[PDB]
Amino acid sequence: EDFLGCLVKEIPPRLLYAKSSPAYPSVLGQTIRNSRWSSPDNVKPLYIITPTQVSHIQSAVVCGRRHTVRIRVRSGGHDYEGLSYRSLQPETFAVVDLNKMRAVWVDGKARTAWVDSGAQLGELYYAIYKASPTLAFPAGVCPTIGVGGNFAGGGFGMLLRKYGIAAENVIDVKLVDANGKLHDKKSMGDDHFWAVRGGGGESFGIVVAWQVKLLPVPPTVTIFKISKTVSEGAVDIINKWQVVAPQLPADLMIRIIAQGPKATFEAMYLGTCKTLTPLMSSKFPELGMNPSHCNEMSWIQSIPFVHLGHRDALEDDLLNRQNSFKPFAEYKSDYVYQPFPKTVWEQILNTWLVKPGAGIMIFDPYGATISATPESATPFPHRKGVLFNIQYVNYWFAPGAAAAPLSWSKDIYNYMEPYVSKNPRQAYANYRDIDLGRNEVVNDVSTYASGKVWGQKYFKGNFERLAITKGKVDPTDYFRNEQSIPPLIK
Numbered sequence: 001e002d003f004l005g006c007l008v009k010e011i012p013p014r015l016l017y018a019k020s021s022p023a024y025p026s027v028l029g030q031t032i033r034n035s036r037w038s039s040p041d042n043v044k045p046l047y048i049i050t051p052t053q054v055s056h057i058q059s060a061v062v063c064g065r066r067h068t069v070r071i072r073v074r075s076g077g078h079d080y081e082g083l084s085y086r087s088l089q090p091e092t093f094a095v096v097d098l099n100k101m102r103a104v105w106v107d108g109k110a111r112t113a114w115v116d117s118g119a120q121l122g123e124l125y126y127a128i129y130k131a132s133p134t135l136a137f138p139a140g141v142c143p144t145i146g147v148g149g150n151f152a153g154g155g156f157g158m159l160l161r162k163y164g165i166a167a168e169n170v171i172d173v174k175l176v177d178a179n180g181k182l183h184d185k186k187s188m189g190d191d192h193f194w195a196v197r198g199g200g201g202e203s204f205g206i207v208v209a210w211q212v213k214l215l216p217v218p219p220t221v222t223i224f225k226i227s228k229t230v231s232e233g234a235v236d237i238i239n240k241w242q243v244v245a246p247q248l249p250a251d252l253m254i255r256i257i258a259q260g261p262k263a264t265f266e267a268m269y270l271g272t273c274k275t276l277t278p279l280m281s282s283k284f285p286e287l288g289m290n291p292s293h294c295n296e297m298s299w300i301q302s303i304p305f306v307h308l309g310h311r312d313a314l315e316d317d318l319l320n321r322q323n324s325f326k327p328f329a330e331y332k333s334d335y336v337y338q339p340f341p342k343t344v345w346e347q348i349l350n351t352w353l354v355k356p357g358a359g360i361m362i363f364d365p366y367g368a369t370i371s372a373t374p375e376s377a378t379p380f381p382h383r384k385g386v387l388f389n390i391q392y393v394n395y396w397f398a399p400g401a402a403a404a405p406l407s408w409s410k411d412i413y414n415y416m417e418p419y420v421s422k423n424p425r426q427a428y429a430n431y432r433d434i435d436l437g438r439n440e441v442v443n444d445v446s447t448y449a450s451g452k453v454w455g456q457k458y459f460k461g462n463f464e465r466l467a468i469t470k471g472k473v474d475p476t477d478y479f480r481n482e483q484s485i486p487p488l489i490k
C-alpha cells in the first residue's frame, strides 16, 4: 500500500500499473520473448513502473528502499529465464520497465552516441545509419534485444572478431544506484564502472543510458551463407574450420548454424567479394567458396540479412516493437579451447541433431580482437585461447510439449562435457541458464557461496572482484535476482 503511495506522490500515475489496472497484462507482456514465462503460472510483479525520465527511476528506487520492495529492471525483455519480469518462487517485486526511454543521439563527427537502455539494438543501429553509412557498433545480431541487458552482460555479434564485445566499447554511463543516486563513470570509480560493463544485468544498478564509441566499417561488406551436408563433407570441413576460423584475419568472421546433418557457414567480411574470394582460396579452400556466394551490401543491411535472410526491408526489420515472435525457448552455452575430435563432430551432426526435441547449435569463432583483451580487463572472461562459443537453442511452439526439448538440452550438455571448457565450465552471462545454479538468500541477502557456483561459470576469475564491488555499491543486496552477483563484504 505505502510503496504504491510513495510512487503516486512522485511519478505520473499513467506510468504506474497494479495487477488490477486494465492495461497491466498488455504492459507486462509487451516485451516477453518466451512463451514459457508469459503464462499465468509464472510469478507476476505487484507493480509495473514505466518511467519516461531519469527522475522517475530515481523516485521508484527511493520508494523501493523506503518501503522494502525490490525492483527488477527490464529494457528489452530478452532475458532467457525472464528474470527481468518474473521470479522463480513467490515473492513481492516491482518491474521498472524502460521501454519508453529509447532515445539514441548520434554524434557522427565525434564518433560517439548516447543510447538509452530501453532502445532496442535495431534502433541503435538504425540511428547510427541515419548519421553515417560507414559507422557501426558491435553488439548482438537480434534487432529486438534491449540495449540495457545486452550491454550489461557483454554483448557480441558479427563484429566481435574485429572490435570485441559491446561493453568494452562503452565510454560512459548514466546509472541509478541502489540508493537512488545518479552516477557517471567519474562518480562511480574504477571498480563500479568495470563491473557494470559486462558483469551482468541488475546487480550493479539501473543503467539509464550508455555512451558508446562508434567504429568504422567499409561502405561495402560481404556476406555469404554456404551449406554443406554430411554427404558434401561437412564433418571434414567443420573439423578444419575450428582451427582456421579463430585464426582468420580480424575482418572475417565465419560462424556456423547446424540443425541436422548439415552445417551452414555464415560469413561477415569487412570488404568486397573481390578480396574475399582469394582470401578464402588461400585460408579455407575446403569450403568451396566462389564469387557467386557473395552478397555485397552496406553494414546496416547486413543486420537483417544475417539474422533474417532479408535484403529488402530495412526499417521494418530494425524498427520492430510488435513482439510477434514468442517461442517457448530453452538455451545453454559452452566455450571450447581444444579442437573436437572428428568423431565428436560426427556425433553432433549425425546423431545429436537428429533426436526428438533437438535444437539448433550456433558456433561463433573467437580469436583476433575479442581474444586479445586480457581475461580480467573486463568482467567477460572468455578471451585468449577460445576457439569458439556454442549456443544450444531450443524453440518449440505448443504448451505441454516442453519435455522432449528440455531433455535434449540436458542430454547434449552432458554429452559435451568432456570436450568443452572445465573447472569451471564456462558459459556466457547473456545466454542465461538457471540450471548452472541459483542463489540462496539468508537474512535477506544472496550468499557468496551460492553465487560462486554459477558465477565462476559466467565470470571465471572475475567473480570475486564483481562480488566485492557489489558489496561496496549494494551491501544490502537490494538489486537482485536468482542469479545476480552476491555482496562480499567485510
Ligand SMILES: *Cc1cc2c(nc3c(=O)[nH]c(=O)nc-3n2C[C@H](O)[C@H](O)[C@H](O)COP(=O)(O)OP(=O)(O)OC[C@H]2O[C@@H](n3cnc4c(N)ncnc43)[C@H](O)[C@@H]2O)c(*)c1C
Pocket: 033, 072, 073, 074, 075, 076, 077, 078, 079, 080, 082, 083, 084, 098, 117, 139, 140, 141, 142, 144, 145, 146, 147, 148, 149, 150, 152, 153, 154, 155, 156, 157, 200, 201, 202, 203, 205, 206, 207, 208, 430, 431, 481
Ligand atoms: C531474445 C534474444 C536474445 C539474444 C539474441 N542474440 C544475441 C546476440 O546476438 N548477442 C548477444 O550478446 N546476446 C544475444 N541475446 C541475448 C541477450 O543479450 C540477453 O538476453 C540480454 O540480457 C537481453 O537484454 P534485454 O533485452 O534488455 O533483456 P531484459 O530481460 O530486459 O534484461 C536482461 C537482464 O539484464 C537486466 N537489465 C535490463 N535492463 C537493465 C538496465 N538498464 N540496467 C541494468 N540491468 C538491466 C535485467 O534485470 C535482466 O537481469 C537474440 C534474441 C532474439
Ligand SMILES: [Cl-]
Pocket: 078, 079, 080, 081, 429, 430, 431, 432
Ligand atoms: Cl539472457
Ligand code: NA
Pocket: 421, 422, 423, 424
Ligand atoms: Na578450465
Ligand code: NA
Pocket: 080, 081, 330, 331, 432, 433, 434, 435
Ligand atoms: Na533455461
